[PDB]
């Protein structure tokens, strides 16, 4: 059993090496140690230190340097004994304390161990490099293990996700978050893969197609960002539906905030979405003269990052890949063309040259790229021509032509541009799911991948969703997290701030943000300052997550969970709005395109429902967390270990930072202030037996013996619970224990 057998990769890559002997000797120590801040301003920042005496209430130690200084024991970072480096729940350390965990963390991350589990977390450091620990070999090792029986792992929590389904009969979700760049997609797929694997009907097209959609997406939803070369661009819910039996039947997706910007503008050094690429290297030298080819290079939309190609990735390759799951996932030969002259017809109107002079309106001396593009999405050139400057426009009882300057006229263009996409991605999604998705399904897992909250330099509307849902997301984990740990004291017979932030944001009355942004929409010529005059009108002085800057007068502050955020409320007016010239959907009606059309003409696609981009999110929200609310959860927290994309390189404030984002560290505090060690009686007496004279290392009267011990020791009855199964320690007591003679 490679469970056991201590030279297999499994113990290899997954396991903290053991040795010849388990013997409590070979970890005796006479030190003690104290975690200490080198350099109080970092504060992330700690050196090892040698406790050397104490005082009653104190502790004098021994810096990296050789100064002494001192402690107050009630704010002293002690340092596990050794035998905790690596334990594989940080909830079996018994001093709680930041350093601490971060410690146990690096430890694992020495040794390429990324996955540990914080008591109902499984955390996960990217690597930045390949460790093959999800091969198939690895996947049937850890079909039907308990969570304890095996080491953590992707693999392993979603074992445990589908037992449950078919143990209760009760639906499942995974939530796997964290920053750009910290590895959710990957362990996303593998979970896929997993499941695929253990629980399809392999002997199948199914199991493929469900695999191939994802490639799809990351084709059209994945870009180069500065974080990280294959970011995905929107958030998104899988469901895999099974049977009563237990066998996949079936899935769906949906996606959340895709980010239609970057398809007409895109930060330096990084890329549009992958597709754009793929075409241009993988069409053949017919789609090229078929599309008005050409290269990146000759392409407003793509050459202006300076970044067309990702390092060790091919172009040309990924889009025989993408070509590929195309097919396995049942798109004709036509759609995929289609697709492509969409994909083509966008980047040709990023070409159009709109100049002036004429008037103030703009005009059309070149009238190339709106051929090509005119041709592409099989409509009417000058019809088009007209829809981009001469708009007509309701002036209420006057339809009457609006002729466009050139800004405008610029700007139009990218609207076009950027529903056309958004709307082919949403196509793409229905597409898959008609395939996929099953209407009679009887339980399902869900899986979510969503970014946690995003704090940047520039935090704007977008953010503000992204930081929303990560509230709600919070506050649901703190309430399960709640009944799951008073759970545990019933069964061993042992004895809020969201919701202002929540309010404050999507309120009905009194009104948050949300609401007064929405209110704004109606008017026409209402402007940024109109609205955050009235948001600093309701919230300044009057709500405490509410912030009005000193200086600024474009943004406010939101005192979220991860902490306090500066939204800059340029734009919101327009992104709430999501216009688009009626002339051009028209336009665009009329196309010969078959999907053209279908993204014109299908309201399901086509229009919101009249409803606002964030009502419309406030909708999406509400019914994930609904659904959500009605599995059971798995909660996976995926950390990056630095800035750089390196590897061997764990960065404590980076990880920190994050560990304090994401709850990870409060799950600490709160357990912390109970009885964080909880002892199964048996396996308490098989290491500490020695340390009483009295009693046997096996031994039937368990609960007995560890009263022995406890008793020998003579231990502050207040230190301890007795479980009908396990032993409840206070935090430390077992520190002190373990630092006892033989
Ligand atoms: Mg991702």
Redesign the pocket.
């Known amino acids: 059993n490679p469970i056991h057998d201590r030279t297999s990769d499994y113990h290899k890559y997954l396991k903290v090496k053991q040795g010849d002997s388990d013997l409590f000797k070979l970890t005796v120590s006479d030190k003690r140690y104290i975690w200490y801040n080198p350099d109080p301003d970092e504060r992330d920042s700690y050196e090892c230190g040698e406790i050397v005496s104490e005082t009653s209430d104190s502790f004098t130690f021994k810096t990296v340097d050789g100064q002494d200084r001192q402690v107050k024991k009630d704010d002293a970072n002690q340092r596990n004994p050794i035998k905790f480096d690596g334990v594989e729940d940080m909830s079996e350390l018994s001093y709680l304390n930041e350093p601490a965990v971060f410690h146990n963390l690096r430890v694992r991350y020495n040794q390429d161990l990324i996955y540990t589990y914080s008591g109902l977390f499984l955390v996960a450091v990217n690597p930045f490099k390949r460790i093959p620990i999800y091969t198939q070999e690895m996947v049937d090792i850890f079909k039907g293990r308990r969570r304890n029986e095996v080491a953590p792992h992707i693999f392993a929590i979603s074992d445990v996700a589908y037992r449950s389904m078919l143990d209760d009969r009760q639906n499942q979700s995974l939530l796997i978050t964290g920053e750009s760049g910290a590895g959710?997609?990957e362990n996303t797929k593998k979970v896929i893969q997993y499941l695929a694997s253990v629980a399809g009907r392999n002997q199948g097209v199914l199991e493929q197609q469900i695999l191939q959609a994802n490639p799809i997406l990351e084709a059209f939803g994945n870009a180069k960002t500065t974080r990280n070369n294959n970011?995905?661009r929107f958030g998104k819910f899988i469901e895999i539906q099974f049977n009563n039996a237990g066998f996949i039947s079936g899935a769906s997706i949906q996606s959340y905030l895709l980010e239609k910007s970057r398809v007409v503008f895109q930060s330096e050094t990084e890329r549009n979405y992958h597709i754009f690429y793929q075409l241009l290297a993988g069409a053949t030298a017919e789609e090229k003269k078929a599309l008005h080819l050409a290269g990146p290079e000759s392409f407003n939309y793509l050459n202006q990052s300076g970044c067309v190609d990702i390092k060790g990735v091919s172009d040309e390759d990924e889009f025989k890949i993408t070509r590929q799951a195309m097919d396995i996932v049942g798109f004709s030969q036509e759609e995929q063309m289609s697709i492509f002259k969409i994909i083509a017809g966008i980047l040709h109107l990023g070409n159009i040259k709109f100049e002036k002079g004429a008037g103030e309106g703009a005009v059309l001396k070149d009238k190339t790229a709106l051929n090509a593009a005119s041709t592409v999405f099989g409509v009417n050139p000058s019809v088009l021509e007209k829809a981009l400057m001469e708009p007509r426009i309701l002036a209420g009882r006057d339809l009457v032509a609006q002729h466009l300057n050139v800004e405008k006229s610029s700007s139009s263009r990218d609207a076009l541009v950027k529903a056309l996409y958004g709307r082919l991605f949403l196509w793409l999604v229905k597409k898959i799911n008609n395939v996929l998705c099953s209407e009679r399904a009887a339980y399902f897992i869900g899986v979510l991948?969503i970014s946690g909250f995003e704090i940047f330099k520039v935090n704007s509307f977008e953010q503000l969703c992204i930081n929303y849902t990560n509230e709600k997301l919070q506050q649901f984990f703190n309430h399960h997290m709640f009944k799951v740990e008073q759970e545990e004291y019933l069964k061993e017979k042992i004895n809020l701030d969201s919701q202002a932030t929540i309010d404050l944001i999507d309120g009905r009355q009194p009104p948050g943000i949300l609401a007064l942004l929405d209110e704004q929409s109606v008017f026409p010529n209402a402007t940024d300052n109109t609205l955050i005059t009235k948001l600093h009108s309701h919230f300044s002085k009057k709500n405490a997550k509410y912030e009005e800057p000193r200086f600024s007068k474009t943004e406010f502050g939101v005192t979220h969970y991860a902490g306090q955020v500066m939204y800059e409320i340029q734009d919101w007016l327009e992104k709430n709005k999501d216009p688009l010239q009626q002339d051009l959907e028209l336009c665009f009606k009329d196309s010969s395109d078959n999907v053209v059309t279908k993204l014109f003409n299908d309201p399901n696609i086509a229009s919101r429902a009249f409803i606002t981009v964030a009502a419309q999110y406030k909708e999406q929200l509400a019914s994930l967390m609904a659904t959500l609310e009605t599995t059971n959860p798995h909660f996976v927290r995926c950390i990056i270990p630095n800035n750089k994309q390196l590897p061997a390189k764990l960065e404590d404030k980076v990880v920190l930072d994050q560990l304090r984002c994401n709850g990870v560290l409060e799950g600490i505090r709160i357990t912390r202030k109970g009885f964080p060690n909880r002892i199964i009686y048996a396996d308490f007496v098989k290491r500490y037996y020695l340390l009483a004279p009295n009693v046997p290392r096996d031994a039937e009267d368990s609960q007995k013996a560890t009263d022995a011990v406890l008793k020998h020791l003579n231990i502050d009855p207040e230190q301890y619970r007795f479980g009908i199964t396990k032993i409840f320690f206070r935090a430390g007591q077992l520190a002190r224990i373990e630092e006892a003679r033989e």
Do not use: I
Request: charged fraction near 40%; glycine fraction near 0%.
């Open positions: 959710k997609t970011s995905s991948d």
